[PDB]
Write a protein that binds this DNA or RNA. Structure first.
Ligand SMILES: [Mg+2]
Ligand SMILES: [Mg+2]
Ligand SMILES: [Mg+2]
Ligand SMILES: [Mg+2]
Ligand SMILES: [Mg+2]
Ligand SMILES: [Mg+2]
Ligand SMILES: [Mg+2]
Ligand SMILES: [Mg+2]
Ligand SMILES: [Mg+2]
Ligand SMILES: [Mg+2]
Ligand SMILES: [Mg+2]
Ligand SMILES: [Mg+2]
Ligand SMILES: [Mg+2]
Ligand SMILES: [Mg+2]
Ligand SMILES: [Mg+2]
Ligand SMILES: [Mg+2]
Ligand SMILES: [Mg+2]
Ligand SMILES: [Mg+2]
Ligand SMILES: [Mg+2]
Ligand SMILES: [Mg+2]
Ligand SMILES: [Mg+2]
Ligand SMILES: [Mg+2]
Ligand SMILES: [Mg+2]
Ligand SMILES: [Mg+2]
Ligand SMILES: [Mg+2]
Ligand SMILES: [Mg+2]
Ligand SMILES: [Mg+2]
Ligand SMILES: [Mg+2]
Ligand SMILES: [Mg+2]
Ligand SMILES: [Mg+2]
Ligand SMILES: [Mg+2]
Ligand SMILES: [Mg+2]
Ligand SMILES: [Mg+2]
Ligand SMILES: [Mg+2]
Ligand SMILES: [Mg+2]
Ligand SMILES: [Mg+2]
Ligand SMILES: [Mg+2]
Ligand SMILES: [Mg+2]
Ligand SMILES: [Mg+2]
Ligand SMILES: [Mg+2]
Ligand SMILES: [Mg+2]
Ligand SMILES: [Mg+2]
Ligand SMILES: [Mg+2]
Ligand SMILES: [Mg+2]
Ligand SMILES: [Mg+2]
Ligand SMILES: [Mg+2]
Ligand SMILES: [Mg+2]
Ligand SMILES: [Mg+2]
Ligand SMILES: [Mg+2]
Ligand SMILES: [Mg+2]
Ligand SMILES: [Mg+2]
Ligand SMILES: [Mg+2]
Ligand SMILES: [Mg+2]
Ligand SMILES: [Mg+2]
Ligand SMILES: [Mg+2]
Ligand SMILES: [Mg+2]
Ligand SMILES: [Mg+2]
Ligand SMILES: [Mg+2]
Ligand SMILES: [Mg+2]
Ligand SMILES: [Mg+2]
Ligand SMILES: [Mg+2]
Ligand SMILES: [Mg+2]
Ligand SMILES: [Mg+2]
Ligand SMILES: [Mg+2]
Ligand SMILES: [Mg+2]
Lengths: 144, 124, 207, 62
RNA sequence: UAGACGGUGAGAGCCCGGUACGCGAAAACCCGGCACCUGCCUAGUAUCAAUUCCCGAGUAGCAGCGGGCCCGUGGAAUCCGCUGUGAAUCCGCCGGGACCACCCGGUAAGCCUAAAUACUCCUCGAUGACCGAUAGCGGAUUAGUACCGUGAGGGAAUGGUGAAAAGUACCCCGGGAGGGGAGUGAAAGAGUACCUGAAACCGUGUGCCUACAAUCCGUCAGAGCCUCCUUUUCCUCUCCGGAGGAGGGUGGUGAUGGCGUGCCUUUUGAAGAAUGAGCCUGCGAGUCAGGGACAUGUCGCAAGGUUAACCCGUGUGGGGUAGCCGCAGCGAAAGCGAGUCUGAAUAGGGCGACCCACACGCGCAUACGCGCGUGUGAAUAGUGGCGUGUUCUGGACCCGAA
RNA sequence: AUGCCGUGGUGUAAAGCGUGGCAGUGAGACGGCGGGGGAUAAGCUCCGUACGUCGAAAGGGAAACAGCCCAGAUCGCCGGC
RNA sequence: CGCGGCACAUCCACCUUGUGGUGGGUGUGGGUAGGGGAGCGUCCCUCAUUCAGCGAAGCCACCGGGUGACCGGUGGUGGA
């Protein structure tokens, strides 16, 4: 019978705690600092390179603008329609969420990477150019 | 959990003060001045466990040299004479024969003298 | 895998089948330890506190002049190097609770009950006392005909109030509902006694 | 609370698909008459941050 | 249905107060039910017409200077304040980030609205991997007292006999204070200076060394005394024991010989005539919060992992899919997508994707392979807990100014 | 003359290189050699040097003596060179 | 250099032929700032087990022990 005095964690899960500043036999008086300067009593910021112009102000900005109205399509490849649906049938935006190939409540989009051999009848948003070539060659149909 | 320190802290204070019984002044009475003295005593001991191997050897040579010159040989030629004769008696015992049994030290001189080169200043 | 249900002052009145995916799981020791630790840490009340140098009463002014005295310069009378000063890095009120996932809690529980079912330590009863008024002397005698050990877990339903009252003040008997089974209370007890209405509720809630 | 990302570094760096950090190049915003076009073409595009700045740029971008 | 907690001459469910569980309210107050009482309604409704009147004024709009919004006057809308100008009542008017046109939403300048939320001087009931007299409140004790300051204000120190006071009757030295003998008690090795009674510091007794020697005060070599134990042949008082002596061995001392420049911080370098410390006991410095950030150890599940607020439970347990990270990238972006941006390019490059160690058929080639079907079933991978190292925001390792 | 870059042999465990976690240091001193500033003065000042020791190195020698000569303390020994 | 103890690294043979021990060569082990690894001691809580008015803790003395922080035994005082 397992009791509570038989429970012990895995080897290496729980290491001890080096308490700094407790004697010369361990990390001693200066507690891993050694200095007499700013590093001895404070924290030097990352954004400060000594007084020269830093890396976040020498360099120019990245060009352009973010689009405020960018629609984003979640992506399923037709090489995963073959692997997840190996007997064909109707493929929809709702059947791809349950099979784990795409997220909820987003606009799906079938791309064309991989090998498709099943006769699938897929109904997505905004098919690719090479997706329509690989689905109709297997006898299927690609409807919006 | 607030921890009092005195049961832990007295363990090393009773070890220094028992190691310091026999020190005059404040060095048997006070923990701060008797820990300083234990740092020097255990260095002087380490320094002198290694130095007393060359103090007793410095005492044995002074007695081998003292008992060589009663048998009109020097220490300089007694040790040359005992390597050519193949006697590997160390200097602890070669200086203990000279006190305990002085008639067996004259015989070791006669072996060291006879097994020595005839002209000691000649090129070998 | 098969458990015979016992009656008070009587004999067997059936058999309850323990399913294998719920009572025959290999015991993961390094998983039961994280779930026990995450339960006892959620029982720390955490109410412990001290005062820092800005909450100890007084200590606003600089106490005397800095130069010319030959004393050290001291800043405030409630500094932590003083007697009566604030505590530096002292305890504050904490919430020592952890966030163990659901699939690790419910797997350490099944591992704890599997090690009971594998050693012949799971029992099943129809009730504890046959009547409706409680009686400890009859419920103590019936838990001694089952087991002879010191720590007994009794898992009975929430609606059976007449049997919960019979085993409240016994030394070494812990009482909980079927929907309150946890790893610490199962591993503490040498023996685990399910009511037959309570054993069919733990199984049915886990298919 | 919650860590704030440096607003000047999030406008001057970005990440690729495998975790490299890219940036643009200086000496190209103005004074462009005397510069031969083999120099303003060397300053075109984007480069990977050097291996000696890649630690500090990471702690700004996170 | 009582094994919660405490008290009693030491660990009490069965000795006491109580606990589980039940009963109990003259009167006063609060809550609720019903009467009395108080108030409202008992004339409009439906259809048609589209001419008229009304739909909150020094208000909205506009302009000047400001305030606040992610928005620091900017192309600057929405909202609010002062000055000037100053409308219209539905074909009216405001808003949808300058503005115009169409369209969609809405009726400003009058007022009142419970619940969800914030807090605890104070009242009851509970609790603590919180403190236990330098701690916990400043305050267990005359405590905001004594004391300091003209004032506003500052602001302490002090707990423990014993189970029971049984608190030492009586005699003795003494002016008393205090003690000795008796007596109490299990114990005065508990005596109102009181449980345990450490260290600094101060005496008394005793063993050894010390008054011709220049000493970081110790260390190694080392004689002589002193003490206490025992092989060893006597004393055979002899059964003994030590009576003594020779020998060995513990503990104390240390004549005398060598070596030896205190601890700490700071420094190129200190025994330093650089800095800090009179001594002892007590206290006094990398802590904690966050689904934070980067990296790693380990555990769970795995193309998935995980919930947050909240709801339900005597709990640490059971529900909860909103969200987050992974799932395909490139580009300033529209976009296109195993590719994509630059370009006139089927040029080259940037970023990204892409497995022959193995048999096959196979256009071919000395071979290895270039290519393609299928396994020999190429080896992948993320996420969420918990440890640790760093780091960010906060007082952030502690102490210290003018 | 040395020093430097390349290459082929031979020798050498704790050499090197890439990529991440955590650093500390960024006031040096003296002696050898080669030079500038100084009066070829300085325990002067500023350089160079797969040069040294100190820093951070105790032990032995130089009477004493961070830096000079010999030599790198794992611990024990009343052993030898 | 000789003779014994300890530790680290690597090599070479075994055992569950690395989750690790045993055995044998060779090499190594001064050290500040600092990095990494492995531990002693004190206090609180849970689980198990065992001592305690036939004397616990705390204290003092003595005799021992371990590679270090330190630990054990006997006795004295003490009273949970
Ligand atoms: Mg120190
Ligand atoms: Mg520094
Ligand atoms: Mg400095
Ligand atoms: Mg300092
Ligand atoms: Mg400047
Ligand atoms: Mg002495
Ligand atoms: Mg020697
Ligand atoms: Mg204040
Ligand atoms: Mg101040
Ligand atoms: Mg306080
Ligand atoms: Mg939960
Ligand atoms: Mg431009
Ligand atoms: Mg040009
Ligand atoms: Mg009790
Ligand atoms: Mg009683
Ligand atoms: Mg403004
Ligand atoms: Mg608009
Ligand atoms: Mg209105
Ligand atoms: Mg209106
Ligand atoms: Mg209102
Ligand atoms: Mg309200
Ligand atoms: Mg309340
Ligand atoms: Mg209260
Ligand atoms: Mg107090
Ligand atoms: Mg006390
Ligand atoms: Mg007054
Ligand atoms: Mg008297
Ligand atoms: Mg008396
Ligand atoms: Mg008596
Ligand atoms: Mg007593
Ligand atoms: Mg007193
Ligand atoms: Mg007393
Ligand atoms: Mg004399
Ligand atoms: Mg002299
Ligand atoms: Mg001397
Ligand atoms: Mg100086
Ligand atoms: Mg001094
Ligand atoms: Mg002096
Ligand atoms: Mg100074
Ligand atoms: Mg001083
Ligand atoms: Mg992008
Ligand atoms: Mg171009
Ligand atoms: Mg390309
Ligand atoms: Mg993982
Ligand atoms: Mg590195
Ligand atoms: Mg500098
Ligand atoms: Mg410099
Ligand atoms: Mg220099
Ligand atoms: Mg010169
Ligand atoms: Mg100089
Ligand atoms: Mg230094
Ligand atoms: Mg030296
Ligand atoms: Mg060196
Ligand atoms: Mg020297
Ligand atoms: Mg000398
Ligand atoms: Mg010689
Ligand atoms: Mg060495
Ligand atoms: Mg070392
Ligand atoms: Mg160090
Ligand atoms: Mg007694
Ligand atoms: Mg006794
Ligand atoms: Mg205790
Ligand atoms: Mg002891
Ligand atoms: Mg004892
Ligand atoms: Mg005792």
């Amino acid at each position: 019978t397992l009791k509570l005095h038989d429970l012990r964690p895995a080897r290496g899960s729980k290491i001890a705690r080096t308490r700094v500043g407790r004697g010369d036999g361990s990390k001693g008086k200066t507690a891993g600092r050694g200095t007499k300067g700013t590093r001895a009593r404070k924290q030097v910021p990352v954004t400060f390179e000594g007084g020269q112009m830093p890396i976040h102000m020498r360099l120019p900005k990245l060009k352009g603008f973010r689009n405020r109205f960018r629609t984003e399509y979640e992506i399923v490849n037709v090489g995963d329609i073959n692997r997840l649906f190996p007997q064909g049938g109707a493929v929809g935006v709702d059947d791809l969420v349950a099979k784990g190939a795409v997220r909820k409540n987003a606009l799906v989009k079938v791309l064309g990477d991989g090998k498709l051999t099943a006769k699938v009848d897929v109904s997505a948003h905004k098919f690719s150019g090479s997706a329509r070539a690989k689905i109709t060659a297997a006898g299927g149909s690609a409807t919006e | 959990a607030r921890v009092k320190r005195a049961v832990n802290a007295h363990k090393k204070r009773r070890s220094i003060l028992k190691a310091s019984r026999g020190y005059r002044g404040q060095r048997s009475r006070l923990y701060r001045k008797a820990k300083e003295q234990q740092l020097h005593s255990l260095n002087y001991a380490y320094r002198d466990r290694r130095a007393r191997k060359g103090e007793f050897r410095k005492l044995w040579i002074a007695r081998i040299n003292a008992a060589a010159r009663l048998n009109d040989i020097t220490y300089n030629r007694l040790i040359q004479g005992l390597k050519a004769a193949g006697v590997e008696v160390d200097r602890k015992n070669l200086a203990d024969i000279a006190i305990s049994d002085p008639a067996a030290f004259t015989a070791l001189v006669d072996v060291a003298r006879a097994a020595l080169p005839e002209d000691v200043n000649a090129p070998s | 895998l098969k458990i015979d249900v016992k009656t008070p002052a009587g004999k067997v009145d059936g058999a309850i089948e323990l399913p294998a995916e719920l009572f025959d799981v290999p015991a993961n020791i390094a998983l039961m330890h994280q779930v026990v630790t995450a339960q006892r840490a959620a029982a720390r009340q955490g109410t412990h506190s001290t005062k820092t140098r800005g909450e100890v009463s007084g200590g606003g002014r600089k106490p005397y002049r800095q130069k010319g005295t030959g004393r050290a310069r001291q800043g405030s009378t409630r500094a932590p190097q003083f007697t009566g000063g604030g505590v530096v890095h002292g305890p504050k009120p904490r919430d020592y609770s952890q966030r163990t996932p659901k699939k690790m809690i419910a797997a350490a529980l099944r591992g704890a009950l599997s090690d009971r079912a594998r050693n012949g330590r799971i029992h099943a009863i129809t009730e504890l006392v046959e009547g409706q008024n409680p009686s400890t002397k009859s419920a103590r005698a019936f838990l001694a005909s089952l087991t002879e050990r010191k720590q007994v877990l009794v898992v009975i339903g929430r609606s059976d109030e007449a049997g919960a009252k019979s085993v409240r003040n016994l030394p070494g008997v812990h009482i909980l509902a079927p929907d309150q089974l946890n790893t610490y209370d199962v591993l503490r007890a040498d023996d685990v006694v399910f009511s037959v209405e309570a054993l069919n509720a733990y199984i049915a809630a886990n298919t | 609370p919650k860590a704030k990302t440096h607003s000047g570094a999030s406008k001057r760096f970005r990440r690729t698909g495998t975790g490299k950090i890219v940036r643009q190049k200086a000496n190209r915003r103005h004074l462009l008459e005397h510069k031969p076009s083999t120099r303003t073409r060397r300053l075109d595009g984007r480069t990977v941050v050097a291996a000696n700045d890649t630690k500090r740029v990471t702690s700004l971008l996170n």
